[PDB]
Symmetry: C4
Subunit: 22 residues, 4 copies
Amino acid sequence: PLVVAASIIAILHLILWILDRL
Amino acid sequence: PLVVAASIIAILHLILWILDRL
Amino acid sequence: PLVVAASIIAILHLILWILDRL
Amino acid sequence: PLVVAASIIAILHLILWILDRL
Ligand SMILES: OC[C@@H](O)[C@H](O)[C@@H](O)CO
Ligand SMILES: *C(=O)c1ccc(Br)cc1
Ligand SMILES: *C(=O)c1ccc(Br)cc1
Ligand SMILES: *C(=O)c1ccc(Br)cc1
Ligand SMILES: *C(=O)c1ccc(Br)cc1
């Protein structure tokens, strides 16, 4: 569950960071 | 342990980054 | 596949962030 | 190696980001 959660969070983080930079 | 550590770190990184942006 | 996707994304995210900072 | 590398990179990314902010 930890690795699954982190994987999802890593994807979320990239998306959010892109939106922040835009 | 590397993968467990990186997973924890990914989650922490997102939390810190959100807090930084706010 | 989720872990593979997240692994690719983690590498991409670092590259993008370094280029943004530079 | 993909997962090992991504794990290393996730740790490096947080270290760099914390240092960048500080
Ligand atoms: O998994 C892809 C999802 O549809 C969203 O995260 C979009 O990419 C957001 O634009
Ligand atoms: C949750 O992501 C998880 C925990 C242990 C093992 Br093994 C696989 C996945
Ligand atoms: C530490 O996260 C770790 C190392 C080797 C294997 Br296999 C699983 C997890
Ligand atoms: C996809 O990355 C993936 C899914 C299940 C298991 Br077990 C390993 C990898
Ligand atoms: C590299 O990280 C790697 C590739 C295949 C398997 Br199985 C474990 C680790």
